[PDB]
């Protein structure tokens, strides 16, 4: 009950803000407040160090590999984006190109299914989508859009279901607007304003695409999430029609307004559930047909990330633990302990091949203390 981790990586000298994993190689990338990115392996004790990435003007806040496994894309708070090219079957990562089109990047993300593609949003509200040349790793801009009038807090690709050439992105802003884009043309498909949500002010924070298996084939249903407790579930394939809208919490007197902030959203197709996690530490599991809460968990402190995986819900917390819940029962099974300060992000890894052996999943964290921890978790 103090540290049940398997191993760790602690080369960062400041907060570990982002963590990404290669789609096929046992390779982690973490980005930190020391303006560095470190590569290390996820299959050994202790991790093997695989290199340090340099060139940033600020803290690194995004690390993600492209879906096909070529290229690492990293972003920092001075607005720089760097592209490293995988060489020697992922054994060496060479800087291929870089850019700096904005003052500060909030969020990046590499498209889950279309090769060599990524998008990012900035504090000035702008939205950018790029592709990466397969041969030399050069940058190819698809679009640049300036519609949001405050910070572009999050983006999420949609219709990821339809092959290359169907490249669509939903972005949201603290100015209450939500926009969908055709990334290839830079065309704004629809834009949600206060007018569409009863005139409510709703500075958006979180976005999450629903699995098609839960929406009867619709590959464009997105749950949103504001910093004052507003949940909107929108149909991006029907002009952003609102499928659900509610305030998810009734705050207590003089309780923090940001306590209602929806920090993370995750869907479960298996259980027809959508979980949201709040700054006040509440975790709410919604039935995705009736949009009513099914289970409610309450953590000691702020939820920082939620992730459904098989029968479980994983939840990282700013108290420095990662909790694992039985998605069906609601029972706490297992808590990852050993961090001093908060867990800012995490990934979950499965054993690649079925060996007729049990083989546990791994949670690997991004710690505010500058430490990543590797946990083996039940079933």
Numbering used by the authors: 53 to 431
From the study:
These structural analyses showed that the C-terminal domain of Sqt1, which is preceded by a non-essential N-terminal extension of ∼50 amino acids, folds into an eight-bladed WD-repeat β-propeller. Moreover, the binding mode of the N-terminal residues of Rpl10 (L10-N) by the eight-bladed WD-repeat β-propeller of Sqt1, as revealed by X-ray crystallography, allows establishing a refined model for the final pre-60S maturation events that lead to the stable incorporation of Rpl10 and the release of Nmd3. We conclude that the β-propeller domains of Sqt1 and Rrb1, which harbour the essential function of these proteins, recognize the very N-terminal residues of Rpl10 and Rpl3.
Sqt1 and ctSqt1 share a high degree of overall structural conservation and mainly differ in three ctSqt1-specific insertions located in the loops connecting β-strands 1c-1d, 5c-5d and 7c-7d. Further Y2H assays showed that the predicted WD-repeat β-propeller domains of Sqt1 (53C construct, deletion of amino acids 1–52) and Rrb1 (60C construct, deletion of amino acids 2–59), which support wild-type growth, are sufficient to mediate the interaction both with full-length or the N-terminal residues of Rpl10 and Rpl3, respectively.
